[PDB]
Amino acid sequence: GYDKDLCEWSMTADQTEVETQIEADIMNIVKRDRPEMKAEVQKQLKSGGVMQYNYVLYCDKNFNNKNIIAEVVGE
Amino acid sequence: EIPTDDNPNMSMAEMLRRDEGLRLKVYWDTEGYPTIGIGHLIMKQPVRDMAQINKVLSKQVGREITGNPGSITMEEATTLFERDLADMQRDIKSHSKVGPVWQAVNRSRQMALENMAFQMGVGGVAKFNTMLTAMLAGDWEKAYKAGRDSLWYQQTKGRASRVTMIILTGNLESYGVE
Ligand SMILES: [Cl-]
Ligand code: NA
Ligand code: NA
Ligand code: NA
């Protein structure tokens, strides 16, 4: 998705703050859509990282954020 | 069967902004290495001292980096990316293990290999012996299975899933490219 404020902030703010926000947004989508995947998503955020998802989540209107679950876990 | 895409409508810049994200200030990767831009590794050491990081980044960018965390512009992120992409694309073609595979496969499968090399280096891709052997033989199912039988797949499963799907199918439908 594209959100002007979150795009700019995620590109520039303190890593820890940005990762907290990305993780919260991902976990909200997980809870809404596929709540059974919560722990699996968390494992992959820990092993694979969090920051990389800023662009698809906030800086790209061509990405539908519902697809972030598959983006993280692969299904 | 499943169609291949010999001229996929996606650039590596697009693919890697998606997979690597986009930062205009320093962050640290999962190995603790200072990074910026689109997966631009500033130093291959787990340095946290921003004065040191900024001095190195200043040389790479060409002007004095300020701030903590240090900051670059979008133009500078683009310039760094173009160079990193050029380096990887040259080296993936020449390496004696990965290169012959790259030469033999279609552009979609090349992008899969390039994506891996941007993540782990050309030398990292070269460790996928079984996968690369299978690709050179056209045994896409064996290559797919080998790629998923890896620490890479367990640690970055989402990215490895969509990349291995390219290896299997020869198209970029796993990245939304019809
Ligand atoms: Cl340090
Ligand atoms: Na923006
Ligand atoms: Na460019
Ligand atoms: Na190339």
Residue numbers in the entry:
A (entry chain C): 23 to 97
B (entry chain A): 165 to 342
Text from the published report:
Here, we describe the structure and function of gp61.3 and show that gp61.3 inhibits the lysozyme activity of gp5 but not that of T4L. In 2002, we determined the crystal structure of gp5 that showed that gp5 consists of three domains: an N-terminal OB-fold (Oligonucleotide/Oligosaccharide-Binding fold, gp5OB-fold, residues 1–129), a lysozyme domain (gp5Lys, residues 174–339), and a needle-like C-terminal β-helical domain (gp5β, residues 389–575). We hypothesized that the mature form of Spackle/gp61.3 (residues 23–97) functions in the periplasm to selectively inhibit the activity of gp5, possibly by direct interaction. Combining all our results with previous work on gene sp and 5 mutants, we propose that the main function of the Spackle protein gp61.3 is to inhibit “free” copies of gp5 that are not incorporated into the virion during T4 particle assembly and thus can escape into the periplasm.
To understand the interaction between gp61.3 and gp5Lys, we crystallized the complex of gp61.3 and gp5Lys obtained (Lane 5), solved its crystal structure by Molecular Replacement and refined it to a resolution of 1.15 Å. The complex consists of one molecule of gp61.3 and one molecule of gp5Lys. The crystal structure contains a fragment of a poly (ethylene glycol) methyl ether molecule (a chemical that was used in the crystallization), four ethylene glycol molecules, three sodium ions, one chloride ion and 382 water molecules. The interface between gp5 and gp61.3 contains 10 hydrogen bonds and 8 salt bridges. The buried surface area is 1733.1 Å2. The two jaw-like subdomains of gp5Lys are further away from each in the gp61.3-gp5 complex compared to that in the gp5 trimer. Thus, upon interaction with gp61.3, gp5Lys becomes “frozen” in an open jaw-like state. In the gp61.3-gp5Lys complex, gp61.3 forms a wall at one of the cleft’s exits, which likely abolishes the endoglycosidase activity of gp5Lys or turns it into an exoglycosidase with a much-reduced turnover rate of polymeric substrate (the peptidoglycan). Therefore, gp61.3 inhibits gp5Lys allosterically by stabilizing one conformation in the gp5Lys catalytic cycle, thus breaking it. Gly322 fits against the C-terminus of helix 5 of gp61.3 (which forms the C-terminus of the protein) so that it leaves no space for a side chain.
